[PDB]
Ligand binder design. Structure first.
Ligand SMILES: [K+]
Ligand SMILES: [K+]
Ligand SMILES: [K+]
Ligand SMILES: [K+]
Ligand SMILES: [K+]
Ligand SMILES: [K+]
Ligand SMILES: [K+]
Ligand SMILES: [K+]
Ligand SMILES: [K+]
Ligand SMILES: [K+]
Ligand SMILES: [K+]
Ligand SMILES: [Mg+2]
Ligand SMILES: [Mg+2]
Ligand SMILES: [Mg+2]
Ligand SMILES: [Mg+2]
Ligand SMILES: [Mg+2]
Ligand SMILES: [Mg+2]
Ligand SMILES: [Mg+2]
Ligand SMILES: [Mg+2]
Ligand SMILES: [Mg+2]
Ligand SMILES: [Mg+2]
Ligand SMILES: [Mg+2]
Ligand SMILES: [Mg+2]
Ligand SMILES: [Mg+2]
Ligand SMILES: [Mg+2]
Ligand SMILES: [Mg+2]
Ligand SMILES: [Mg+2]
Ligand SMILES: [Mg+2]
Ligand SMILES: [Mg+2]
Ligand SMILES: [Mg+2]
Ligand SMILES: [Mg+2]
Ligand SMILES: [Mg+2]
Ligand SMILES: [Mg+2]
Ligand SMILES: [Mg+2]
Ligand SMILES: [Mg+2]
Ligand SMILES: [Mg+2]
Ligand SMILES: [Mg+2]
Ligand SMILES: [Mg+2]
Ligand SMILES: [Mg+2]
Ligand SMILES: [Mg+2]
Ligand SMILES: [Mg+2]
Ligand SMILES: [Mg+2]
Ligand SMILES: [Mg+2]
Ligand SMILES: [Mg+2]
Ligand SMILES: [Mg+2]
Ligand SMILES: [Mg+2]
Ligand SMILES: [Mg+2]
Ligand SMILES: [Mg+2]
Ligand SMILES: [Mg+2]
Ligand SMILES: [Mg+2]
Ligand SMILES: [Mg+2]
Ligand SMILES: [Mg+2]
Lengths: 73, 101, 119, 88
RNA sequence: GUGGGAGAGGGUGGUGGAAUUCCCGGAGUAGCGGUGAAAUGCGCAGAUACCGGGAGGAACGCCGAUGGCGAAGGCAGCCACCUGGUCCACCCGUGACGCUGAGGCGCGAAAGCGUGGGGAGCAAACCGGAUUAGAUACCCGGGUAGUCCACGCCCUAAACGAUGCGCGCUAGGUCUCUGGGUCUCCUGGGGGCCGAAGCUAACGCGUUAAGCGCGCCGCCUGGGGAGUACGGCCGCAAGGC
């Protein structure tokens, strides 16, 4: 059920198409450098589809990770 | 003419002297490709999420331009020829899709 | 001998064996073990037990170099992965941290017919 | 591609009278533009079969329209053609 | 037509990171690998496991779906260029210019063929190890064609919704993708589910019809013999119609 707190709630205004806003895009990735589900992002079909693309742009710019090792276990 | 955004990432270990020779070539190149600079953002060097070219950082650039479409790719080619240039990403400008507004 | 005191402990779990490698802070192996180093032969090398033994063999051999604390780095999914984590924790060696770094491709090479229905 | 200006220049250059946007002439002119600009695309990029199905449709439409003219005003017909440069 | 929109629709070029394999360097030692259990195999010419550097091929994790695009086959990292389809609004222009479509032409998964290139992983055949009463298999270790690219052929399929295309008519409820609006809701296009009437041998279908109707095309007429024989046409061949 993932009832933590949709990443959209815990945040406000932001340009879903800004691939450079590291401090905000960073929020949509998991412990790992994986793009979070709509389940957690709280976004919508259209919103998420645009997020996914901007995040991938950030990755190729080195501002965001493609993958990150998991701590603990 | 179309509006783009030229992202350029340079070597983070350049002395103010070299750092300006690369920009010189970035400029002396943009012009050769009908690149009208509507603005720039020398964001400086930043901590990369992963190492690029062995280095853990990179000096960033950003130029909002306007130029002849049939030469965007041809331009990109050139920009990448340099060495202290380890990244080049030209993107068609887009109106911001605000969210949670 | 060289005296390290602090390093890394890599666990490589498989459904066929568990092999521990201990290295210096730069990832250079100091010692290592496995279900094979210990007396085990066939299918028992994959046993969680054997993993325990292999993990302990590793720690001890690492004490000889005078090592004390390490950063555990787990790779793989295999019966006996967690026993190795526990084995190390309960062995004088201080486990400053555990980290799973199992490699996963962003879909690269076609798997063996045995591991397909995937890519 | 095809900018408004080009489209306009071609629409005005063919309208039967000011304000004429959807007449058999204006349409055949427009098509002829898309058809020509596409056939240019396909000399290069000749493996682009999906777009080619688009070419076929356009050539089809133009034909059915021209046919209409030749049957409703054989005069406007030969006029339109000659002007454009259709037939071959 | 004008103005907006969504999309893995197509083509060309460029480019990113993960992983596998190989090569080089370091560090380190007796095994690794594999299975039901094993063995073949690989390793003291130092493998496996670990760190650093390099090369190359192929495929794109998360997002990702119960989702989207396309006429079908099919299409999934990211960037640019070239290009197709399509939906909505405004009622602006033409004035029945329409539907279907024998033949023709084009497209058409995989395997396969020809020429040239490439070859990391995978793997028909094949070489071995096990298993078995046997095992020309299933399991394990190898491995050539091929799988990849270009250009040219081949033209098949459970090429499936097993449901030809178009148009009008006939309760609703609910989820969803994309657009418009006076934005609890309404209205248009698409994707699902449950269902009115009705239809169906039944199963089931049911505004995404398998209902009620009109138009045009394709096709069926007991099973085996047989998708064979003959002929014709097509193909380099395999072989297709
Ligand atoms: K929004
Ligand atoms: K689907
Ligand atoms: K052959
Ligand atoms: K192919
Ligand atoms: K072909
Ligand atoms: K709306
Ligand atoms: K019934
Ligand atoms: K049923
Ligand atoms: K024959
Ligand atoms: K022949
Ligand atoms: K054939
Ligand atoms: Mg074993
Ligand atoms: Mg429009
Ligand atoms: Mg596409
Ligand atoms: Mg690599
Ligand atoms: Mg070596
Ligand atoms: Mg050595
Ligand atoms: Mg031997
Ligand atoms: Mg020796
Ligand atoms: Mg050797
Ligand atoms: Mg190796
Ligand atoms: Mg390496
Ligand atoms: Mg090679
Ligand atoms: Mg469709
Ligand atoms: Mg399909
Ligand atoms: Mg388009
Ligand atoms: Mg009107
Ligand atoms: Mg009138
Ligand atoms: Mg084919
Ligand atoms: Mg093929
Ligand atoms: Mg071939
Ligand atoms: Mg070849
Ligand atoms: Mg070769
Ligand atoms: Mg193999
Ligand atoms: Mg035998
Ligand atoms: Mg085999
Ligand atoms: Mg099907
Ligand atoms: Mg009704
Ligand atoms: Mg419905
Ligand atoms: Mg509907
Ligand atoms: Mg709807
Ligand atoms: Mg669907
Ligand atoms: Mg009933
Ligand atoms: Mg019944
Ligand atoms: Mg139903
Ligand atoms: Mg109907
Ligand atoms: Mg028949
Ligand atoms: Mg008969
Ligand atoms: Mg008979
Ligand atoms: Mg018969
Ligand atoms: Mg046959
Ligand atoms: Mg022939």
């Amino acid at each position: 059920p993932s009832r933590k707190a949709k990443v959209k709630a815990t945040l406000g205004e932001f340009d879903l198409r800004d691939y450079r806003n590291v401090e905000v895009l960073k929020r949509f990735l998991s412990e790992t450098g994986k793009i979070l589900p709509r389940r957690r992002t709280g976004l919508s079909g259209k919103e998420q589809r645009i997020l996914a693309k901007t995040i991938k742009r950030a990755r190729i710019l080195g501002l965001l990770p493609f993958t990150e090792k998991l701590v603990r276990k | 003419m179309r509006r783009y955004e030229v992202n350029i990432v340079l070597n983070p270990n350049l002395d103010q002297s070299q750092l300006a020779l690369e920009k010189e070539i970035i400029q002396r190149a943009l012009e050769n490709y009908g690149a009208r600079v509507e603005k720039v953002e020398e964001l400086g060097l930043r901590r990369l999420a992963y190492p690029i070219a062995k280095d853990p950082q990179g000096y960033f650039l950003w130029y909002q331009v306007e130029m002849p479409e049939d030469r965007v790719n041809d331009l990109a080619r050139e920009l990448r020829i340099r060495d202290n240039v380890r990244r080049v990403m030209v993107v068609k400008s887009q109106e911001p899709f605000l969210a949670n507004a | 001998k060289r005296q390290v005191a602090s390093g890394r402990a890599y666990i490589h779990a498989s459904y066929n064996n568990t092999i521990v490698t201990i290295t210096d802070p730069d990832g250079n192996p100091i010692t290592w073990s496995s279900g094979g180093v210990i007396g085990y032969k066939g299918s028992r090398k994959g046993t969680p037990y054997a993993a325990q033994l292999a993990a302990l063999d590793a720690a001890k051999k690492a004490m000889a170099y005078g090592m004390q604390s390490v950063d555990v780095i787990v790779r793989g999914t295999g019966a006996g992965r967690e026993q190795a984590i526990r084995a190390l924790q309960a062995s004088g060696l201080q486990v400053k941290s555990i980290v799973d770094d199992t490699p996963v491709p962003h879909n690269g090479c076609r798997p063996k017919k045995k591991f397909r229905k995937a890519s | 591609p095809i900018t408004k200006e080009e489209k306009q220049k071609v629409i005005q250059e063919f309208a039967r009278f000011p304000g004429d946007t959807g007449s058999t002439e204006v349409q055949v002119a427009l098509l002829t533009l898309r058809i020509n600009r596409l056939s240019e695309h396909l000399k290069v990029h000749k493996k682009d079969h999906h777009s080619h199905r688009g070419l076929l449709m356009m050539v089809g439409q133009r034909r059915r329209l021209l046919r209409y003219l030749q049957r409703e005003d054989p005069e406007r017909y030969r006029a339109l053609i000659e002007k454009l440069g259709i037939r071959g």
